[PDB]
């Protein structure tokens, strides 16, 4: 049984220093490193880098944090301490009352259901498609950022850039596309140097920095036809683009023939232009320079749902900075266009979970009613959390919290600017439903991987 | 079985070391510290910045403190001793409200609140003085203070009328800004403190040696 | 040194039992995975105690028995490496308490043999083929228990009755009566018509794809008809007069069903309209190769061979009963039953949409393999705990026919296989000491009448069910296990336990 | 954190009294320093053979003993309980609740538990004082004590209770029932069967002379003398000594003539029996024989305070004086032999009824003969607890009183708002420690039948009023069982009085301890 109990403590000695980088208040932290230099930083998904640890689950839980750092932007913290306050909770029903691992086990899937379905009737329904509902759901990721006094036009960058990865498709025939949405590969950018950041737009296609390899051509083609080719030169299409150079003696072969060559092309970029080719219906062949370098445009009138983002700023500098912003602000855009909802922030959707868990595992009568108890409590961990980093009494502010949810409604959350219990809804506090489906749901599954082993073996 | 760990005693106790440090030293009154690497160099400075520069702590809340000062010298150039007094003794001071069970975040949003209300007291307690070339007569007393601090003020009178005419002599009048690169400092052993002139043009390290060369020439043409 | 006594006797229970409890929780299918964690750091993450057994470090002259033990399960049966090792270390501890009984090694290790002979003998009596197919259904359970993990598993009662009588009649003599089942078969094909539950089962072959112009007939030759076979295209070659002589060759040949893989041209589809030959474009590679064997055809690769062009009349053309084309819903299928010999069929999965039906397909698959495994072995025994069970009150009375200090051995055997179903029920959180114990009591009434060749309410057969928590027979239930795995897995443990106990001393340099 | 340690201490004597509540009890052997070894399965009176170190653990002694005196029953109801709400309690003071507000809940759950016990009465004891009728009252206590006795000593200890009580109803000003009414006696030789009940008290010695046992007369006179048999002398000193030979037949004969006209004049009176407390002579015995007088000699004061309530005799000062008055009158007295031995005993017929009486144990195991003589004391209170004070009203036992009150108390947790709610609720589930030591004990599963108690006292029926079996008690099992079994065909139930006595003393005693958060000791 000592194994269960080093398998617990290894999760729950991670999350308990974790503990004050969840929330806007969130304390900052310290790290020695062996060098005079030091990490200052609160952010989670930093310090967890560089700890070192020993014990094998609670690497299995740095590898969870990293998987939740690639969905979502935040909320990275949250999942970690979650997992780890569920080990804690259930340490005296493993070890003390001498309940099987799997009966736990077995429990978490049946309250991971459950969880689910509270926090859907929780959510409230808002308007995906209205676009000025859009620009202050992502505002919450703009302020207090660098780019506060670009908001106004971060605003409207950020929800084009969303509106041009996703695709609005559903029907009972093909099933449910889920409408597809990737920010790694589809929504990658492409930073160029100068320009204005409120000139910047979204284009739909590949765009590459190579002109025109003949001094006499023309620069614009009606129907323009791309076609992909691997091996360098060295049914007549009206464009020619070679991956590799194109040396002199293929210009003036290829000139008679009424296309234009097209040397010198990533092979990155090659899997994006099947997206908007497959080159027929190719909308706008435009060479026109944009900041005193020569362009092309691949783009067409269709939506593949794939891109690069064309994005310009006063410099570099100015990119490095919006490049991470705007990557993290389209994380909590593309939330919204999974699901027509809206969850309440600062705890309320974490006590919504407990309260309704408690009721409806008294009505079961089973050996999984013991711990529902524990998940209950760990539920009402994370609000508590907030509260201790809020300077609020913790025993005070959740007994009263935990009664209102039994009166009133289920939006009602802790406030970290006060500190004391306040509505979320009227006060625009607003959190997406999917970093809370994406909490509840990779932490009951990382710790029951957790309690399946009970023996560590040594070897290679 | 495990509650917290209350955490703390660490941070504040090792920056009240740094302060008693740095207490003696600040002012026109302070005293001259003198550090030893054992190679032979042999320092003595009263800025702090220099002195932090030159001494590895391995408490790490002393190294913000020295990083704190970066920011101060190229931009402030002076007080980075009056800003680390300032950091240590509000930790002395909030540490009684920490032990009462205050929460360290009303501690520091209090200070937010204080700084920002600081600024608006400051802009009233300022006194604007105007840019002609006139206060010469009233920049005296100000070079002074950055001289009376770091000297014993025997060399105050002798260094403030080379300080003020440093400045003065290649900055035409006019909003503009000043140049401290093209004032060069050498050095030259075996005299006294007490000599040290001003020198209007550009001094030359090899100079001719032969006894014909004539010691003064007026009003000459270089080439 | 130079060590020799009760020491070593020692050691090697002690070295057993660190790696019993290795395999101890991975036991099942209920069991659990573990983390097996190197000197550089790194980790890994699974489930199957085979793996764990290969990695794992074990420096005694005896644990290192075991890991050649758990490579020889492996590269021949491949399964059941978890459940040999457990044997081995509950028979080395046993024989370690005979010490103090002043028992000789090679008594043990004689009544070890002469009780292994005799115990196969004893399960060659209870060996059964495959029964209960008429009156009940012992199949359905297995490709149940297995989609109970997908979405399938809801609807899995009526689509195993599909898949069970498709299999059952794809056997074939195979190389001299061999009755080997393939591994690949019956194509799975997906529709959007209806629900889920409206899949039919057709008898026969099914291709996905159209007739192209419908002036064609969809029913022709109702008598006999000829499937011809050709990967060579009827269309224009990238002229004119090649493609007609390769079409001359067809009508003149008396076949009604043409299969093209790049498809046919409209002006060779002109002489099939008065013919009432079927044609089809654009045909699947992959989808005529399996024809060939299931019409009696043969592939075309060209029709340039040698100097001469023509299809090989009679040669190449496969015997049929009849080709219907049913209307479908969305896609519509093609009909191909009564071939010369095919003893296949195809299964057509319609449902609401192919993103449910592209993870039924796929789980059939591999709930297939689960029911082409069992039934590749004809002789095949209940497990779950049945053949620890019932041999183990069979020794006890048999243990009296030899004797001569051999009983004690033949005692302590038989009491070493009740740690299998022990161990097993611990991952299912189910009291091991009272499913065990239960066990015994319900096979040892059903072997007192069993000789008598009479019987009232006896049986036998009685497994343990850990999903449902009851004691139910797994025939029934859909757990079944092939007599060379269970024979093996029993005959080699054995084998690695006798030398274990042969070393008196061990000498280290 | 040494409130944390002081119940780890607590725990290490817990699970001490874990072992000696229910059916699998079983006594602790302790060797006293003296050399003499004290065998009993009650845990009260180990208290008193352990030697305590920590004195927090001594507040839960004293609080034992308070159990002991006044009911005498529910003695481990009070430890066991108390010590469980001791880790309840430490998740939180962990939690950061404070132990004030942890106290201030119990007082409020302590007075919303008592209202609720009048509710749960289901049964009423008529006090008729039946032999059948004691049969209910005795059985349980008997229980979780010695198995396999209580069928045989429900019968020896009824039987003796209605033997003391005179016959009244509804009168309860004049109490009757005492704690020295029954006395507990031991023989080597027989059985629990062949055990019998005595109306009177049982002398297990010789009557040292060469009458054997008086005859059937009614209304033999019983004399008890503190003086010694003996010719009168004066009280300061009189140490007879000889001086010369002529003096020597004087004295003999003077002893022979006054100690003879001594007893005939008792033996005129009637008085058969003569009970002598100091020691008696050799010429005392040989008139004794003659007159036909039982000699009998209790030294011991507390078995002639007994003896005096039932004859009526009363202890003379002098020697010589049978003043009728004070003689006592017994209906029958014989010297029988029970258990392989003669000795002469004392009992009645109808009138002189007797107020104490005496039980007499047969059997061939002497470690169990000593392990019934403490459980037959632990009956003797119940009897009581029959009296005003709630004595008719009982609760089922069984584990059935103590899960019924977790959906009572958890009811009235949500009804009170504030911080209270966390005490409340933990104050419920500190009783689930009653049903799980009766399920650990018994070898039954905790993942088995703890779930089926849960859903025996909650379930869902279509409509207001509760149905079905609201009886279901913790069942120890031992043989086979499905589920639990209900209590009302065993019989087994609880008293009011000892039940509502056993939950503040055991309130009051873990209020004790959480309210002290330092411990100043000192070196002897």
Same mark, same amino acid.
């Given at each position: 049984?000592?194994?269960?109990?080093?398998?617990?403590?290894?999760?729950?000695?991670?999350?308990?220093?974790?503990?004050?980088?969840?929330?806007?208040?969130?304390?900052?932290?310290?790290?020695?490193?062996?060098?005079?230099?030091?990490?200052?930083?609160?952010?989670?998904?930093?310090?967890?880098?560089?700890?070192?640890?020993?014990?094998?689950?609670?690497?299995?839980?740095?590898?969870?944090?990293?998987?939740?750092?690639?969905?979502?932007?935040?909320?990275?913290?949250?999942?970690?301490?979650?997992?780890?306050?569920?080990?804690?909770?259930?340490?005296?029903?493993?070890?003390?009352?001498?309940?099987?691992?799997?009966?736990?086990?077995?429990?978490?899937?049946?309250?991971?259901?459950?969880?689910?379905?509270?926090?859907?009737?929780?959510?409230?329904?808002?308007?995906?498609?209205?676009?000025?509902?859009?620009?202050?759901?992502?505002?919450?990721?703009?302020?207090?950022?660098?780019?506060?006094?670009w908001s106004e036009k971060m605003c409207e960058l950020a929800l084009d850039a969303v509106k041009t990865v996703r695709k609005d498709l559903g029907q009972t025939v093909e099933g449910e596309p889920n409408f597809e949405i990737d920010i790694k590969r589809y929504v990658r950018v492409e930073k160029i140097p100068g320009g204005d950041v409120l000139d910047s737009r979204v284009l739909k296609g590949v765009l590459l920095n190579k002109d025109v390899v003949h001094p006499k051509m023309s620069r614009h083609i009606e129907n323009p036809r791309v076609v992909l080719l691997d091996c360098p030169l060295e049914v007549r299409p009206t464009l020619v683009i070679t991956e590799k150079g194109v040396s002199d003696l293929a210009q003036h072969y290829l000139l008679?023939?009424?296309?234009?060559?097209?040397?010198?092309? $990533?092979?990155?970029?090659?899997?994006?232009?099947?997206?908007?080719?497959?080159?027929?219906?190719?909308?706008?062949?435009?060479?026109?320079?944009?900041?005193?370098?020569?362009?092309?445009?691949?783009?067409?009138?269709?939506?593949?749902?794939?891109?690069?983002?064309?994005?310009?700023?006063?410099?570099?500098?100015?990119?490095?900075?919006?490049?991470?912003?705007?990557?993290?602000?389209?994380?909590?855009?593309?939330?919204?266009?999974?699901?027509?909802?809206?969850?309440?922030?600062?705890?309320?959707?974490?006590?919504?979970?407990?309260? $309704?868990?408690?009721?409806?595992?008294?009505?079961?009568?089973?050996?999984?009613?013991?711990?529902?108890?524990?998940?209950?409590?760990?539920?009402?961990?994370?609000?508590?959390?907030?509260?201790?980093?809020?300077?609020?009494?913790?025993?005070?502010?959740?007994?009263?919290?935990?009664?209102?949810?039994?009166?009133?409604?289920?939006?009602?959350?802790?406030?970290?600017?006060?500190?004391?219990?306040?509505?979320?809804?009227?006060?625009?506090?607003?959190?997406?439903?999917?970093?809370?489906?994406?909490?509840?749901?990779?932490?009951?599954?990382?710790?029951?991987?957790?309690?399946?082993?009970?023996?560590?073996?040594?070897?290679? | 079985?495990?509650?917290?760990?209350?955490?703390?005693?660490?941070?504040?106790?090792?920056?009240?070391?740094?302060?008693?440090?740095?207490?003696?030293?600040?002012?026109?009154?302070?005293?001259?510290?003198?550090?030893?690497?054992?190679?032979?160099?042999?320092?003595?400075?009263?800025?702090?910045?220099?002195?932090?520069?030159?001494?590895?702590?391995?408490?790490?809340?002393?190294?913000?403190?020295?990083?704190?000062?970066?920011?101060?010298?190229?931009?402030?150039?002076?007080?980075?001793?009056?800003?680390?007094?300032?950091?240590?003794?509000?930790?002395? %001071?909030?540490?009684?409200?920490?032990?009462?069970?205050?929460?360290?975040?009303?501690?520091?949003?209090?200070?937010?609140?204080?700084?920002?209300?600081?600024?608006?007291?400051?802009?009233?307690?300022?006194?604007?003085?105007?840019?002609?070339?006139?206060?010469?007569?009233?920049?005296?007393?100000?070079?002074?203070?950055?001289?009376?601090?770091?000297?014993?003020?025997?060399?105050?009178?002798?260094?403030?009328?080379?300080?003020?005419?440093?400045?003065?002599?290649?900055?035409?009048?006019?909003?503009?800004?000043?140049?401290?690169?093209?004032?060069?400092?050498?050095?030259? %052993?075996?005299?006294?403190?007490?000599?040290?002139?001003?020198?209007?043009?550009?001094?030359?390290?090899?100079?001719?040696?032969?006894?014909?060369?004539?010691?003064?020439?007026?009003?000459?043409?270089?080439? | 040194?130079?060590?020799?006594?009760?020491?070593?006797?020692?050691?090697?229970?002690?070295?057993?039992?660190?790696?019993?409890?290795?395999?101890?929780?991975?036991?099942?299918?209920?069991?659990?995975?573990?983390?097996?964690?190197?000197?550089?750091?790194?980790?890994?993450?699974?489930?199957?105690?085979?793996?764990?057994?290969?990695?794992?470090?074990?420096?005694?002259?005896?644990?290192?028995?075991?890991?050649?033990?758990?490579?020889?399960?492996?590269?021949?049966?491949?399964?059941?490496?978890?459940?040999?090792?457990?044997?081995?270390?509950?028979?080395?501890?046993?024989?370690?308490?005979?010490?103090?009984?002043?028992?000789?090694?090679?008594?043990?290790?004689?009544?070890?043999?002469?009780?292994?002979?005799?115990?196969?003998?004893?399960?060659?009596?209870?060996?059964?083929?495959?029964?209960?197919?008429?009156?009940?259904?012992?199949?359905?359970?297995?490709?149940?228990?297995?989609?109970?993990?997908?979405?399938?598993?809801? @609807?899995?009662?009526?689509?195993?009755?599909?898949?069970?009588?498709?299999?059952?009649?794809?056997?074939?003599?195979?190389?001299?009566?061999?009755?080997?089942?393939?591994?690949?078969?019956?194509?799975?094909?997906?529709?959007?018509?209806?629900?889920?539950?409206?899949?039919?089962?057709?008898?026969?072959?099914?291709?996905?794809?159209?007739?192209?112009?419908?002036? !064609?007939?969809?029913?022709?030759?109702?008598?006999?008809?000829?499937?011809?076979?050709?990967?060579?295209?009827?269309?224009?070659?990238?002229?004119?007069?090649?493609?007609?002589?390769?079409?001359?060759?067809?009508?003149?040949?008396?076949?009604?069903?043409?299969?093209?893989?790049?498809?046919?041209?409209?002006?060779?589809?002109?002489?099939?309209?008065?013919?009432?030959?079927?044609?089809?474009?654009?045909?699947?590679?992959?989808?005529?190769?399996?024809?060939?064997?299931?019409?009696?055809?043969?592939?075309?690769?060209?029709?340039?061979?040698?100097?001469?062009?023509?299809t090989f009349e009679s040669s190449y053309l496969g015997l049929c009963d009849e080709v219907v084309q049913a209307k479908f819903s969305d896609d519509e299928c093609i009909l191909i039953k009564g071939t010369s010999k095919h003893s296949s069929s195809s299964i057509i999965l319609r449902g609401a949409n192919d993103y449910s039906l592209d993870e039924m397909e796929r789980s059939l698959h591999d709930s297939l393999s689960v029911v082409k495994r069992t039934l590749e072995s004809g002789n095949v025994v209940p497990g779950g705990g049945c053949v620890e069970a019932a041999l183990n009150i069979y020794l006890d009375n048999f243990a009296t026919t030899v004797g001569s200090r051999e009983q004690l051995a033949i005692a302590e055997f038989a009491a070493a296989?009740?740690?299998?179903?022990?161990?097993?029920?611990?991952?299912?959180?189910?009291?091991?000491?009272?499913?065990?114990?239960?066990?015994?009591?319900?096979?040892?009434?059903?072997? !007192?009448?069993?000789?008598?060749?009479?019987?009232?309410?006896?049986?036998?057969?009685?497994?343990? @069910?850990?999903?449902?928590?009851?004691?139910?027979?797994?025939?029934?239930?859909?757990?079944?296990?092939?007599?060379?795995?269970?024979?093996?897995?029993?005959?080699?443990?054995?084998?690695?336990?006798?030398?274990?106990?042969?070393?008196?001393? !061990?000498?280290?340099? | 954190?040494?409130?944390?340690?002081?119940?780890?201490?607590?725990?290490?004597?817990?699970?001490?009294?874990?072992?000696?509540?229910?059916?699998?009890?079983?006594?602790?052997?302790?060797?006293?320093?003296?050399?003499?070894?004290?065998?009993?399965? =009650?845990?009260?009176?180990?208290?008193?053979?352990?030697?305590?170190?920590?004195?927090?653990?001594?507040?839960?002694?004293?609080?034992?003993?308070?159990?002991?005196?006044?009911?005498?029953? &529910?003695?481990?109801?009070?430890?066991?309980?108390?010590?469980?709400?001791?880790?309840?309690?430490?998740?939180?003071? /962990?939690?950061?609740? /404070?132990?004030?507000?942890?106290?201030?809940?119990?007082?409020?759950?302590?007075?919303?538990?008592?209202?609720?016990?009048?509710?749960?009465?289901?049964?009423?004891?008529?006090?008729?004082?039946?032999?059948?009728?004691?049969?209910?009252?005795?059985?349980?206590?008997?229980?979780?004590?010695?198995?396999?006795?209580?069928?045989?000593?429900?019968?020896?200890?009824?039987?003796?209770?209605?033997?003391?009580?005179?016959?009244?109803?509804?009168?309860?000003?004049?109490?009757?029932?005492?704690?020295?009414?029954?006395?507990?006696?031991?023989?080597?030789?027989?059985?629990? /069967?062949?055990?019998?009940?005595?109306?009177?008290?049982?002398?297990?010695?010789?009557?040292? &002379?060469?009458?054997?046992?008086?005859?059937?007369?009614?209304?033999?006179?019983?004399?008890?003398?503190?003086?010694?048999?003996?010719?009168?002398?004066?009280?300061?000193?009189?140490?007879?000594?000889?001086?010369?030979?002529?003096?020597?037949?004087?004295?003999?004969?003077?002893?022979?003539?006054?100690?003879?006209?001594?007893?005939?004049?008792?033996?005129?009176?009637?008085?058969?029996?003569?009970?002598?407390?100091?020691?008696?002579?050799?010429?005392?015995?040989?008139?004794?024989?003659?007159?036909?007088?039982?000699?009998?000699?209790?030294?011991?004061?507390?078995?002639?305070?007994?003896?005096?309530?039932?004859?009526?005799?009363?202890?003379?000062?002098?020697?010589?004086? +049978?003043?009728?008055?004070?003689?006592?009158?017994?209906?029958?007295?014989?010297?029988?032999?029970?258990?392989?031995?003669?000795?002469?005993?004392?009992?009645?017929?109808?009138?002189?009824?007797?107020?104490?009486?005496?039980?007499?144990?047969?059997?061939?195991?002497?470690?169990?003969?000593? =392990?019934?003589?403490?459980?037959?004391?632990?009956?003797?209170?119940?009897?009581?607890?029959?009296?005003?004070?709630?004595?008719?009203?009982?609760?089922?036992?069984?584990?059935?009183?103590?899960?019924?009150?977790? /959906?009572?108390?958890?009811?009235?947790?949500?009804?009170?708002?504030?911080?209270?709610?966390?005490?409340?609720?933990?104050?419920?589930?500190?009783?689930?420690?009653?049903?799980?030591?009766?399920?650990?004990?018994?070898?039954?599963?905790?993942?088995?039948?703890?779930?089926?108690?849960?859903?025996?006292?909650?379930?869902?029926? +279509? &409509?207001?009023?509760?149905?079905?079996?609201?009886?279901?008690?913790?069942?120890?099992?031992?043989?086979?069982?499905?589920?639990?079994? =209900?209590?009302?065909?065993?019989?087994?139930?609880?008293?009011?009085?000892?039940?509502?006595?056993?939950?503040?003393?055991?309130?009051?005693?873990?209020?004790?301890?959480?309210?002290?958060?330092?411990?100043?000791?000192?070196?002897?």
């Open positions: 049984r000592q194994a269960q109990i080093s398998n617990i403590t290894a999760a729950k000695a991670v999350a308990d220093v974790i503990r004050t980088c969840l929330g806007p208040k969130a304390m900052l932290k310290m790290l020695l490193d062996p060098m005079g230099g030091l990490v200052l930083t609160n952010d989670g998904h930093a310090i967890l880098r560089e700890i070192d640890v020993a014990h094998p689950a609670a690497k299995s839980m740095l590898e969870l944090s990293r998987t939740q750092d690639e969905e979502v932007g935040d909320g990275t913290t949250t999942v970690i301490i979650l997992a780890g306050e569920i080990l804690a909770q259930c340490a005296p029903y493993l070890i003390e009352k001498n309940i099987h691992p799997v009966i736990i086990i077995q429990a978490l899937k049946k309250a991971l259901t459950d969880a689910l379905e509270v926090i859907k009737q929780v959510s409230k329904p808002v308007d995906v498609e209205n676009d000025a509902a859009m620009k202050k759901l992502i505002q919450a990721s703009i302020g207090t950022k660098y780019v506060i006094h008679k023939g009424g296309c234009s060559v097209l040397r010198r092309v $990533k092979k990155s970029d090659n899997n994006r232009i099947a997206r908007v080719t497959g080159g027929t219906n190719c909308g706008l062949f435009k060479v026109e320079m944009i900041g005193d370098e020569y362009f092309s445009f691949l783009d067409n009138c269709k939506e593949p749902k794939a891109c690069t983002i064309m994005l310009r700023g006063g410099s570099k500098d100015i990119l490095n900075e919006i490049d991470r912003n705007l990557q993290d602000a389209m994380a909590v855009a593309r939330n919204v266009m999974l699901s027509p909802s809206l969850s309440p922030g600062g705890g309320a959707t974490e006590m919504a979970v407990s309260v $309704k868990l408690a009721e409806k595992a008294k009505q079961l009568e089973g050996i999984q009613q013991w711990p529902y108890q524990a998940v209950a409590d760990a539920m009402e961990c994370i609000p508590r959390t907030l509260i201790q980093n809020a300077g609020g009494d913790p025993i005070r502010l959740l007994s009263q919290l935990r009664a209102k949810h039994a009166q009133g409604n289920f939006t009602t959350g802790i406030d970290g600017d006060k500190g004391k219990i306040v509505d979320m809804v009227s006060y625009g506090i607003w959190e997406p439903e999917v970093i809370k489906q994406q909490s509840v749901k990779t932490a009951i599954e990382s710790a029951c991987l957790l309690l399946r082993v009970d023996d560590i073996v040594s070897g290679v | 079985s495990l509650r917290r760990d209350a955490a703390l005693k660490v941070n504040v106790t090792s920056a009240e070391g740094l302060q008693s440090v740095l207490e003696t030293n600040l002012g026109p009154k302070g005293t001259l510290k003198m550090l030893v690497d054992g190679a032979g160099n042999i320092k003595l400075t009263k800025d702090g910045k220099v002195l932090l520069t030159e001494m590895q702590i391995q408490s790490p809340t002393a190294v913000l403190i020295a990083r704190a000062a970066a920011a101060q010298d190229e931009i402030t150039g002076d007080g980075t001793t009056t800003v680390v007094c300032l950091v240590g003794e509000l930790l002395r %001071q909030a540490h009684r409200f920490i032990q009462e069970g205050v929460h360290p975040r009303i501690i520091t949003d209090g200070f937010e609140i204080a700084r920002k209300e600081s600024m608006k007291f400051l802009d009233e307690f300022k006194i604007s003085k105007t840019n002609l070339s006139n206060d010469r007569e009233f920049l005296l007393q100000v070079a002074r203070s950055s001289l009376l601090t770091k000297v014993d003020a025997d060399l105050t009178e002798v260094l403030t009328p080379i300080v003020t005419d440093a400045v003065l002599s290649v900055y035409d009048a006019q909003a503009d800004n000043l140049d401290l690169h093209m004032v060069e400092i050498m050095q030259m %052993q075996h005299l006294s403190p007490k000599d040290t002139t001003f020198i209007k043009g550009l001094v030359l390290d090899h100079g001719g040696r032969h006894p014909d060369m004539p010691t003064r020439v007026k009003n000459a043409y270089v080439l | 040194e130079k060590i020799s006594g009760d020491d070593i006797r020692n050691q090697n229970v002690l070295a057993t039992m660190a790696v019993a409890n290795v395999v101890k929780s991975s036991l099942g299918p209920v069991g659990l995975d573990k983390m097996l964690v190197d000197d550089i750091g790194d980790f890994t993450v699974t489930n199957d105690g085979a793996t764990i057994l290969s990695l794992l470090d074990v420096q005694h002259p005896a644990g290192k028995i075991l890991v050649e033990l758990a490579q020889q399960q492996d590269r021949e049966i491949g399964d059941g490496t978890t459940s040999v090792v457990i044997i081995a270390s509950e028979l080395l501890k046993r024989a370690n308490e005979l010490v103090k009984n002043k028992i000789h090694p090679t008594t043990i290790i004689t009544g070890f043999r002469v009780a292994l002979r005799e115990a196969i003998r004893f399960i060659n009596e209870v060996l059964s083929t495959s029964v209960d197919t008429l009156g009940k259904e012992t199949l359905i359970n297995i490709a149940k228990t297995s989609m109970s993990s997908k979405i399938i598993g809801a @609807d899995s009662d009526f689509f195993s009755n599909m898949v069970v009588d498709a299999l059952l009649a794809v056997k074939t003599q195979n190389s001299k009566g061999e009755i080997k089942y393939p591994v690949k078969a019956v194509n799975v094909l997906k529709a959007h018509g209806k629900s889920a539950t409206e899949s039919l089962l057709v008898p026969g072959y099914a291709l996905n794809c159209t007739v192209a112009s419908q002036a !064609m007939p969809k029913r022709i030759a109702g008598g006999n008809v000829k499937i011809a076979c050709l990967d060579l295209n009827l269309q224009k070659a990238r002229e004119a007069g090649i493609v007609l002589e390769r079409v001359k060759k067809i009508i003149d040949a008396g076949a009604q069903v043409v299969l093209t893989t790049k498809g046919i041209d409209d002006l060779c589809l002109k002489e099939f309209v008065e013919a009432k030959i079927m044609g089809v474009r654009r045909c699947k590679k992959e989808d005529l190769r399996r024809i060939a064997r299931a019409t009696g055809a043969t592939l075309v690769s060209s029709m340039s061979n040698l100097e001469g062009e023509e296989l009740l740690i299998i179903p022990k161990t097993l029920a611990v991952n299912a959180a189910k009291d091991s000491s009272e499913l065990v114990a239960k066990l015994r009591s319900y096979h040892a009434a059903s072997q !007192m009448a069993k000789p008598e060749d009479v019987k009232r309410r006896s049986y036998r057969n009685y497994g343990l @069910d850990l999903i449902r928590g009851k004691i139910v027979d797994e025939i029934h239930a859909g757990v079944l296990e092939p007599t060379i795995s269970k024979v093996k897995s029993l005959k080699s443990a054995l084998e690695a336990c006798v030398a274990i106990l042969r070393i008196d001393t !061990m000498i280290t340099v | 954190g040494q409130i944390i340690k002081s119940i780890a201490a607590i725990r290490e004597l817990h699970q001490m009294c874990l072992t000696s509540m229910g059916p699998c009890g079983r006594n602790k052997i302790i060797v006293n320093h003296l050399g003499k070894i004290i065998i009993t399965n =009650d845990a009260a009176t180990m208290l008193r053979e352990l030697d305590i170190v920590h004195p927090a653990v001594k507040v839960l002694v004293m609080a034992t003993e308070q159990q002991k005196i006044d009911m005498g029953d &529910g003695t481990n109801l009070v430890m066991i309980l108390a010590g469980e709400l001791l880790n309840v309690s430490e998740k939180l003071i /962990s939690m950061g609740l /404070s132990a004030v507000e942890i106290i201030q809940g119990y007082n409020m759950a302590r007075k919303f538990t008592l209202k609720e016990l009048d509710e749960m009465v289901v049964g009423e004891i008529t006090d008729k004082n039946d032999k059948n009728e004691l049969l209910k009252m005795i059985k349980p206590v008997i229980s979780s004590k010695k198995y396999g006795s209580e069928d045989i000593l429900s019968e020896l200890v009824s039987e003796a209770v209605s033997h003391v009580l005179p016959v009244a109803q509804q009168a309860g000003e004049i109490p009757y029932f005492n704690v020295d009414s029954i006395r507990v006696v031991k023989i080597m030789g027989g059985s629990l /069967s062949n055990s019998t009940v005595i109306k009177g008290m049982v002398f297990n010695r010789e009557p040292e &002379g060469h009458v054997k046992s008086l005859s059937e007369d009614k209304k033999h006179k019983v004399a008890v003398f503190t003086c010694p048999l003996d010719i009168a002398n004066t009280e300061t000193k009189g140490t007879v000594l000889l001086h010369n030979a002529q003096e020597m037949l004087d004295f003999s004969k003077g002893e022979e003539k006054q100690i003879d006209a001594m007893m005939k004049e008792i033996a005129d009176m009637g008085v058969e029996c003569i009970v002598a407390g100091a020691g008696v002579g050799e010429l005392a015995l040989h008139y004794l024989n003659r007159y036909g007088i039982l000699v009998l000699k209790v030294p011991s004061k507390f078995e002639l305070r007994r003896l005096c309530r039932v004859c009526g005799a009363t202890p003379l000062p002098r020697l010589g004086a +049978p003043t009728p008055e004070e003689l006592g009158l017994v209906e029958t007295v014989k010297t029988m032999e029970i258990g392989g031995d003669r000795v002469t005993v004392f009992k009645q017929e109808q009138g002189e009824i007797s107020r104490t009486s005496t039980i007499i144990l047969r059997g061939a195991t002497q470690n169990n003969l000593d =392990d019934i003589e403490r459980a037959i004391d632990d009956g003797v209170a119940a009897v009581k607890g029959l009296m005003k004070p709630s004595g008719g009203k009982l609760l089922p036992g069984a584990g059935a009183t103590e899960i019924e009150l977790i /959906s009572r108390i958890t009811k009235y947790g949500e009804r009170t708002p504030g911080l209270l709610q966390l005490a409340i609720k933990q104050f419920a589930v500190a009783f689930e420690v009653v049903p799980r030591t009766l399920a650990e004990t018994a070898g039954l599963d905790v993942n088995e039948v703890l779930p089926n108690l849960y859903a025996a006292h909650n379930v869902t029926e +279509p &409509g207001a009023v509760k149905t079905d079996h609201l009886y279901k008690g913790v069942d120890i099992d031992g043989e086979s069982d499905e589920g639990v079994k =209900d209590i009302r065909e065993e019989n087994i139930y609880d008293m009011l009085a000892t039940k509502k006595f056993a939950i503040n003393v055991a309130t009051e005693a873990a209020t004790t301890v959480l309210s002290i958060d330092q411990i100043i000791m000192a070196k002897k």
